[PDB]
Write a protein that binds this DNA or RNA. Sequence first.
RNA 1: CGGUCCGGCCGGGAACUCAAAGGAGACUGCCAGUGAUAAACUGGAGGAAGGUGGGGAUGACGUCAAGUCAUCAUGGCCCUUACGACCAGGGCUACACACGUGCUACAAUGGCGCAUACAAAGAGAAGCGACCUCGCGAGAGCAAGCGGACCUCAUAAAGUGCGUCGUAGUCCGGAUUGGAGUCUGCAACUCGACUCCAUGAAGUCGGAAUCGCUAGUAAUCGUGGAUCAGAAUGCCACGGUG
Lengths: 100, 127, 151, 83, 99, 208, 116
Amino acid sequence: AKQSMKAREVKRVALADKYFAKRAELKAIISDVNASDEDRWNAVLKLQTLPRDSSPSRQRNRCRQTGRPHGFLRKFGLSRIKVREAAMRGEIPGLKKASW
Amino acid sequence: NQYYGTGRRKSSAARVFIKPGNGKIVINQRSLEQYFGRETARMVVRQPLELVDMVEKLDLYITVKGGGISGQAGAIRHGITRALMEYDESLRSELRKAGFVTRDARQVERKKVGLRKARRRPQFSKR
Amino acid sequence: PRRRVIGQRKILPDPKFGSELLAKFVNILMVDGKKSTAESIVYSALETLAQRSGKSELEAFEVALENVRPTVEVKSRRVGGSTYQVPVEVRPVRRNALAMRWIVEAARKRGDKSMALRLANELSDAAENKGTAVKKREDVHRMAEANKAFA
Amino acid sequence: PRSLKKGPFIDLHLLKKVEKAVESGDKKPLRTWSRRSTIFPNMIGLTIAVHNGRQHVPVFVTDEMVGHKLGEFAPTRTYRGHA
Amino acid sequence: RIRIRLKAFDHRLIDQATAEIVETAKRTGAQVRGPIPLPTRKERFTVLISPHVNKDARDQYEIRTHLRLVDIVEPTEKTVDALMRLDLAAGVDVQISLG
Amino acid sequence: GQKVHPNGIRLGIVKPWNSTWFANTKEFADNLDSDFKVRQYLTKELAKASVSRIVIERPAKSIRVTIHTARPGIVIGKKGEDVEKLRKVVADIAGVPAQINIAEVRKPELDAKLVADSITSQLERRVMFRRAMKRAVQNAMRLGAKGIKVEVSGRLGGAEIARTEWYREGRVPLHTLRADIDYNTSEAHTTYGVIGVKVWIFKGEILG
Amino acid sequence: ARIAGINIPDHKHAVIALTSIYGVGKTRSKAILAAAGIAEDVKISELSEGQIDTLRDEVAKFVVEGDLRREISMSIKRLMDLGCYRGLRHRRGLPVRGQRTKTNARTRKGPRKPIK
RNA sequence: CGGUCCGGCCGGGAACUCAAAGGAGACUGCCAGUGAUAAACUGGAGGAAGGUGGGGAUGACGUCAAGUCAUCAUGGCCCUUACGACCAGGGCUACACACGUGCUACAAUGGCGCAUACAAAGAGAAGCGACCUCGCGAGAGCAAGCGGACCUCAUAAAGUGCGUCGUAGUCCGGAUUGGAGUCUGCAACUCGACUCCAUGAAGUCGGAAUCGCUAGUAAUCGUGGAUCAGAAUGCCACGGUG
Ligand SMILES: [Mg+2]
Ligand SMILES: [Mg+2]
Ligand SMILES: [Mg+2]
Ligand SMILES: [Mg+2]
Ligand SMILES: [Mg+2]
Ligand SMILES: [Mg+2]
Ligand SMILES: [Mg+2]
Ligand SMILES: [Mg+2]
Ligand SMILES: [Mg+2]
Ligand SMILES: [Mg+2]
Ligand SMILES: [Mg+2]
Ligand SMILES: [Mg+2]
Ligand SMILES: [Mg+2]
Ligand SMILES: [Mg+2]
Ligand SMILES: [Mg+2]
Ligand SMILES: [Mg+2]
Ligand SMILES: [Mg+2]
Ligand SMILES: [Mg+2]
Ligand SMILES: [Mg+2]
Ligand SMILES: [Mg+2]
Ligand SMILES: [Mg+2]
């Protein structure tokens, strides 16, 4: 993948770990039924004012070696290709071709 | 003096305990007529005890796990045959002929890649 | 197949009568693996068959089967510029399978409401030796004795 | 649609432009890229030029346009016909 | 008592470690319950082996995660610490549950 | 587009994994990135060193890297000089305390990665590929291999039409599962392109 | 057999002949018969005229044929007059709800129009 | 067994199921016949299994200058104040049409309503999320337990039993559309899924033509997972009937 797309992914991780407590504060406010509706309105306007890249749903799990946005696996952090290359070189423990 | 046999089927596993008696069938603390709402399964669980003449002769305590209606009935038949051969062993010459002592090894086939099922291939088109 | 003729698998008999043939009939009637329903349909149609005839359900089934069993079928050969429908003696197994198949197809095609009503009516007509199933038996024998010159 | 407990949605920069144009009472066209903002009753009588991807189409705001969003009045695909 | 859970990838290396720790607490302590085996997790995987386009061309991998449960009925003082100072091979993850 | 990887197919039978650790899913891909970065670093640093197999194992939050190499004198230097230099940066990368062990490679002519990299180095310094393939086969069968197959591919002698060639001496049963097939692959970055090298070595059958 | 303007078949049951009413379905027909205390398995046959008057009152509680069709056409002409995307879809004859127009829009577009 | 709140529940017990680990077992091994005393074939005998037991993985030399420089890598060429980089919005979802692959159907071997029985295999910590309460409902609140043979996802459905419809474009079918909503997520207009009420298209088994399948198979019935905030009729797996 590109270098700029990798840089965008790192930036969206840094912001998602930075503002993580504050966004949950505001969502606790908005989801709280026992709250002032003007407070819930102020919270949702604050949440607009926060950057869009602070959301974890904005960032996409790329391959950790190549940045490939598709074919990802959460357990390995890799695409389906580099999984196969590592499993064939025996860099992945306990992983072998199955048959049942 | 209960006599035991384990029967297995597709994915079922019966635990059959034979006692001499009057012919009382208890499956998971339930009657056979209560448990299998199916006369074919009521037949196949009574098939060896009428191959031999032991319908009235023995009572039975059965537990069974896993599977379906025919699966549990098959493992029950195979447990009964295993236990009657434990009881007498002179009956193996007939129950082999009846095809009962043979464990039916017809497992389900796995789904394969590309194929929508075990063997059904998707629909083909040249053009 | 090319290499071998095979050895066929064993079928259970029905629980009611012990007949292998009736279970072959419920398998031919059965769709989608629902054997329990097809067993119920056969036992209801043979219930009304013995009601309409006073005989055994098994006996009147064999009578209706008897009046539709073919003896000679045909097959296409086509070694020349056109199709030869060559006759051939039918083995008693295929006689019985074609009979139960034709009966089921006609009972699907009848306009009665219950399937057991289409099948008991078709069996009672076959025992009277009329109906579409025997008309299929007739059209088969007619193409047989027409192409009888080929042997 | 959105839940009622979150209420409606509107961009803050839009809500400030609405509050300004309300107090000034001017109907100059407000160019806006907020196609996702629900129209409010205080927006009635305003020309708001909603973006469509390519330009800003002006929308005079009516009473009935309240419970909707601004993007509904800016179509993004031009289609005339094939023949 | 002490429940001990062993999770590993090699079943020889886990049965070697479980019988090792049994013989350890059998000599030092007393009443090792048994090396009770648990069901093995089979974490399957299925990937496309082509870089661009072959949907039907796949590999199917798995990971078999072998479990062992070993209980110690009467913990002496040396039973605990001498087995805690005892170390095993890598690949085995141990997890003690005192009571 | 036809043949399976002989190591990956032999991994449960006669071949061991090059990474032997255990982790849950939380720290799995993180360990595997750390292993990738350290194998990357060690290959670039020990490029002149005849390194074959970097084995990684991490017990008790402490990484242990076992390097198999044909000559340990240039990797070590003095006893814990260059090794200790590489150890403190491995612990920097892995974020855990490190430990480096070195296994000497007897008979470096019987190791697939070394042979392929020697061929690659020769092709990079512009030798005849057939002479390199011959000397690799003669040396391995002399050293006692039961069978070797080498194969080069693409842009051979600067020829615009890429072809593959392969030599074979002895029996190389790939379908035999209990066969000790040492397989590895190198790449030569010539001025005319990329030349790929594959090498199979059959040592004999393990009778497990 | 004449409820809310329209006739109702007598041979059918209660919920079904009610569902002949434009504005009720099997749910609202159960709510009607529940509010009238009338069993659902009975017919429109063998009903008292007091029972039918109760039925007419319960249906009259809701919005039905002429009212409902007028309200629906009013909602559509509201979208028509606004000129929203749903209005443009309603007057181009295209599907509104965000379905596909490349293929399978045959309910709104009718049968196929051959290129001649 | 003994005891019970009748629930393996509770003392207990280790046989049984099961869970793994190791091992045995089937080899034409035996018997007869054929065969060129060969190879081998046919049969039966036992046996859980009989001749490759079943299924998978495993894909020779090479072919198509097949595919991919958009996984990656890379020779060379090109751009370098732009062919690079940042942001908002839009688009990849358009629509006179044509094709492929699928899903649901045209019903009575069925639809509905009530009652009720039997699965396997899996996933789970920024997660699975009981119980209880509110809501017709999707869901909401409080909130245990669980890194999990312990807890959760999670009641399997088809089935069976009773009643019902009684051959109709129907109590089939569910498209479409209106209104009211929930959840996710800064944010569901373009452009999400789901729920409720109403709406109730075509369709009554499909032209020439054509596809799959030889046994636990097809057919049919449900289940789970990956990806994923959310978003499958797809994909990969699982068992039921057969
Ligand atoms: Mg790049
Ligand atoms: Mg995402
Ligand atoms: Mg496909
Ligand atoms: Mg299936
Ligand atoms: Mg075509
Ligand atoms: Mg292959
Ligand atoms: Mg109605
Ligand atoms: Mg034999
Ligand atoms: Mg080409
Ligand atoms: Mg390109
Ligand atoms: Mg953008
Ligand atoms: Mg697309
Ligand atoms: Mg409630
Ligand atoms: Mg039912
Ligand atoms: Mg009913
Ligand atoms: Mg309906
Ligand atoms: Mg509806
Ligand atoms: Mg029509
Ligand atoms: Mg009809
Ligand atoms: Mg999931
Ligand atoms: Mg999802």
